[PDB]
Amino acid sequence: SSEERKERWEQGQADYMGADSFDNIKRKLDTYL
């Protein structure tokens, strides 16, 4: 997880249906907004 998630992103499609979905991205972005 975390770093392994980053490596999965780099190699190919991440878990866009799961953890790497845009829900987690939107949360980690809303923290900045």
Added chain:
Amino acid sequence: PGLEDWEDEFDLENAVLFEVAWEVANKVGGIYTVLQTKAKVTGDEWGDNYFLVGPYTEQGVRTQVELLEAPTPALKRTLDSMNSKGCKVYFGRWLIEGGPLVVLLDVGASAWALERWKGELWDTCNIGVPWYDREANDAVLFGFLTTWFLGEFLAQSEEKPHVVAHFHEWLAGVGLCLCRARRLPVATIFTTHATLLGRYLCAGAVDFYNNLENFNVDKEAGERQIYHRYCMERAAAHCAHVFTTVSQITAIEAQHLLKRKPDIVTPNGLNVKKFFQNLHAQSKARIQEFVRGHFYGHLDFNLDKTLYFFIAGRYEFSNKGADVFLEALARLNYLLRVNGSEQTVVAFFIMPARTNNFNVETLKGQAVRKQLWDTANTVKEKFGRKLYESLLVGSLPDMNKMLDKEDFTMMKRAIFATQRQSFPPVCTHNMLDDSSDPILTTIRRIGLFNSSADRVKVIFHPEFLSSTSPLLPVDYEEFVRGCHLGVFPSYYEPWGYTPAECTVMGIPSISTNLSGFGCFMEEHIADPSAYGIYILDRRFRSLDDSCSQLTSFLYSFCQQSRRQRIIQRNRTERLSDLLDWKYLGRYYMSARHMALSKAFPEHFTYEPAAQGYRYPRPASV
């Protein structure tokens, strides 16, 4: 109404506008022209506090940017700093109408930071670009460089000005997200000129707009290996004080794909000074000479009753609606034949395609028209000299003796050149793949072979119009001005640049409510068809029913009198002011004011468009 007086109550407070786009000083799309033509009004509103942030490219600086020294000590200091910190940042003046200052960031020069930046990106947005995506990695580099420049420009500025950063695609969206993550004081606009998913979803899916809510955007981007690009665009839209689209159709797509309704729509304006009836007459004469050459041996239709329709732009068969236009042209051919009309419709398809060369019949027909024109001119000058000589001696010409043996030899040679049995070619070029060409395939499927019975002739010109061209020595603008009706029944068109330019050139055009320009005109003109603007309904009609409506539009245009067509062209000429940045810069101004107020509510307060740019029923209809 002017642009300087729009929202004049707003005081920018010596704010500085950084407009960030991958297309700044490098033409890689249509947004390059948007930025180029908008730079004039943006610099009028911001003076030299306006910076276009682009990627450095050797061609762009060679051709378009005069490298300069930063006018202010803050800019010079930040440039020197980040140039000493392993980046290669150029400053210059973009040699365009506005003369805007450009900060160009060599993304390649700073690729060393990629891994620490993209990892850093993953530490702030959970977005990780795959290595193989050159454009996504370049976007990450450009965004990190832009956020670096903004941070080091605010840091290295004693006054600490109010910075409005306006990013223009997902390529600048990374820098937008980093501006929000670092929390540095930047009022951020995100304009999306086309949703990234929209392209794939329109091209692949049978129906895309009516299924917008029924799309799993994460999954849909996932199957197409562009999940990171989609996430960058959606984070830019999410991490933006103001979110903007160039169109209301793009606004709908962004609502259902980027999960944010644009705070405002900023239609692509145009520098209308760059671009009607006498000029149209000359261009129509030139098109008529081309048609005379192309249909040599087959000029059995009245050319004064001939209408010139055209569809131009990129050769995207379904997105540009060339399929719908061809279906409607077949149906209109049937309508004009069964109704026994003497009207002829030559529909031009100016859609570039891989072509080997001009078709032999096309170039030969142009040569035949040139020969007949020269023969007629020579015989006409001989006849005119003889007639003037005869009238000078008080003698009435004896027409039998007027033409000599050499005149008859020249004219018989011309007539011999005229004979042809093959029908005029549908295409003016040699297609590398005639069998696989969608336009030619559709034309041969629907039965438009430029036969004498066909009231609709089709001329596919699979190449851009150029003056240097031998076949048509006319550039695109002049040819278009010579046409009667632009037809752009686009399915996917975030903004209609071709229909917008057609309208600015004063040519009645058919667009769609699926196109940004079509939606913009439909919402700015009470009766668009009165103004030469036919809005085909492609959202709420099937492709077959949209073809029927397009046939109705084409037929009603054909059934107008020359007086009605002139009135309609006068109205479309009037429409040009809607598409000027002098009006459409209002929306960019209001977006920037909105972003300033959102990011700095203490310093700026925004007071919420088309006033003075509404076109009700023409008084004369």
